[PDB]
Design a protein around this ligand. Structure first.
Ligand SMILES: CC[C@H](N)C(=O)N[C@@H]1C(=O)N2[C@@H](CC[C@@H]1CCN)CC[C@H]2C(=O)NC(c1ccccc1)c1ccccc1
Ligand SMILES: CC[C@H](N)C(=O)N[C@@H]1C(=O)N2[C@@H](CC[C@@H]1CCN)CC[C@H]2C(=O)NC(c1ccccc1)c1ccccc1
Ligand SMILES: CC[C@H](N)C(=O)N[C@@H]1C(=O)N2[C@@H](CC[C@@H]1CCN)CC[C@H]2C(=O)NC(c1ccccc1)c1ccccc1
Ligand SMILES: CC[C@H](N)C(=O)N[C@@H]1C(=O)N2[C@@H](CC[C@@H]1CCN)CC[C@H]2C(=O)NC(c1ccccc1)c1ccccc1
Ligand SMILES: [Zn+2]
Ligand SMILES: [Zn+2]
Ligand SMILES: [Zn+2]
Ligand SMILES: [Zn+2]
Lengths: 102, 100, 101, 103
């Protein structure tokens, strides 16, 4: 499964970060390596695989952890990081839903 | 308790006076599940967990929706039990994934 | 045309204010006189005539002024207060739509 | 006055419309030309100048008319379209606030 066939390569994902804001603390290298490509609005990124979108990147935020925290069933994440890493992150944040709503 | 004035079924039933007739879910089922009318659209809130629900359709059950979205509500647990809350959570394991 | 025929009379509008919160600064007498009846949730009121709803009543808020501010074309408000009042209030608040956006 | 200094240029507004839904009948060219940029949720757009937001675009909807219909005091709209255009649009829709409180 792949949601965006044109963003399947790191090189293509890196090309979308041309007009990425300089002010954003997270670097485009860490983002593209985690399967994300720039979408052209704010600091909005999407995964070429799971179509999962992330935004509001702050200092210290890691793209792989955020990818595991919000989109744990992404096939690309699982292939790269493994099931142990995804289980560990899901365990650290057991009330994502409760928190979004509360 | 998030709303001390909505503790009683009678008080929750009073809010549904000018509830739309077009909405398929009846105020009797809603107030019994801890919900009171919020005065906008078909928006309801639980007096206990402050959890809000809207967009009620034909066949939607207030206790099951309360269990899907707000499973740690003390009122829902006291009335329906941990088995019900667990069974509903098992039927809907990708709720977050659904909305995202 | 009247939106609620059962709330035509001041007496009927006053009866809806039975479970009205004591904490609300605006009194049910001022509200019912301005065509409003309680809708049974929060401090939400509706006019029997134009079906216009108001809420979040604070200290000093006048029901007749708020009626002209938000629902100026209400036949009841026009009959009771007149076109001069409605016009004067509409002149004081010329950017209401802009204000809420 | 300008609410978003980074969206001052047509080029910058056009860049936000990359992953805009194909299903939406109104084209990003008309939108960006009317001062709007893509916000990133639904078909939600905002004016770089007046911070006025619009959504639920349907077939036949014109961005300049909607801009005049909802945000008539926007300096950018006035400079581009003129006071005659804004006045005519305000005249066709005299009960906008009322229409919201009714529907
Ligand atoms: C990524 C680090 C950041 N601090 C963070 O965790 N942000 C969260 C987030 O991006 N999302 C979670 C919400 C809490 C956060 C919002 C601001 N802190 C839910 C998933 C994600 C999010 O808001 N995604 C957006 C989206 C869509 C398109 C492109 C990018 C982001 C979204 C909104 C509504 C529905 C679906 C997705
Ligand atoms: C209740 C049956 C209905 N079909 C349903 O399940 N609706 C969902 C829903 O109410 N909520 C879930 C979202 C998917 C649904 C939205 C429309 N289908 C998330 C919790 C709830 C919701 O949207 N709550 C609102 C809310 C607030 C205040 C009063 C009522 C409802 C809300 C929005 C944003 C943050 C927190 C809560
Ligand atoms: C009445 C004094 C108060 N300070 C006030 O002016 N409130 C405003 C208000 O009631 N309305 C205006 C919005 C700004 C205010 C909201 C809180 N300050 C718009 C008309 C009214 C309002 O919000 N009405 C509600 C409503 C519906 C049903 C019963 C009561 C109130 C409403 C919301 C959405 C659409 C239509 C009407
Ligand atoms: C633009 C054509 C469309 N058919 C239309 O006229 N939509 C209206 C609209 O966008 N707005 C008017 C409401 C009636 C419409 C809503 C759906 N038909 C009021 C101004 C605008 C609107 O809803 N703006 C939103 C908003 C916020 C942020 C981004 C985009 C839109 C808004 C909601 C609440 C307060 C302030 C603005
Ligand atoms: Zn992914
Ligand atoms: Zn609850
Ligand atoms: Zn009225
Ligand atoms: Zn503008």
């Amino acid at each position: 499964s792949i949601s965006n066939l044109s963003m399947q390569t790191h090189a293509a994902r890196m090309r979308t970060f041309m007009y990425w804001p300089s002010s954003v603390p997270v670097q485009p290298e860490q983002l593209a390596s985690a399967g994300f490509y720039y979408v052209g609005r704010n600091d909005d990124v999407k995964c070429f695989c799971c179509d999962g979108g992330l935004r509001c990147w702050e200092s210290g935020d890691d793209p792989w952890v955020e990818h595991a925290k919000w989109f744990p069933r992404c096939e690309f994440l699982i292939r790269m990081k493994g099931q142990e890493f995804v289980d560990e992150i899901q365990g650290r944040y057991p009330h994502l839903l409760e928190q979004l709503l509360s």
